[PDB]
Design a protein around this ligand. Structure first.
Ligand SMILES: CCCCNC(=O)N1CCN(C(=O)c2ccc(C)o2)CC1
Length: 121
């Protein structure tokens, strides 16, 4: 399965599944600084799933590893901003992270395998 370009549509489909998850609602658009006035005191690099989808559709990811780094930043931002491990929005992030990691692992493996096959000779 050595298609070097296959990751892009695989990531589009996984983003569609994440947008159908009720657990993604807080992560679909940038944090409102009006409602969370201290957000940018703590978070130096905002990230949301609409920004990830737009970056992918612009052709501004070279690899699924770059997309994976931005999605993991959504989750690390939620962990850094939460006042408690028992917060609603943080708990939604942990379930969504487990779902994302379960589905991205084959996308990364197949891409890296395809690149190794491309350089085989
Ligand atoms: C305007 C449409 C939604 C915008 N998102 C949004 O407001 N947030 C999601 C990110 N965030 C957190 O990760 C987080 C962790 C713990 C708590 C209370 O928030 C801050 C809130």
């Amino acid at each position: 399965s050595y298609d070097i370009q296959a990751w892009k549509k695989q990531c589009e489909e996984l983003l569609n599944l994440i947008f159908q998850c009720e657990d993604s609602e807080p992560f679909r658009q940038p944090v409102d600084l009006l409602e969370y006035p201290d957000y940018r005191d703590i978070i130096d690099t905002p990230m949301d799933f609409a920004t990830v989808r737009e970056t992918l559709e612009a052709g501004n990811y070279e690899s699924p590893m770059e997309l994976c780094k931005d999605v993991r930043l959504i989750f690390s931002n939620s962990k850094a901003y939460t006042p408690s491990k028992r917060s609603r929005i943080y708990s939604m992030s942990l379930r969504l992270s487990a779902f994302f990691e379960e589905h991205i692992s084959s996308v990364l493996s197949d891409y890296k395998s395809a690149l190794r096959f491309h350089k085989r000779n």
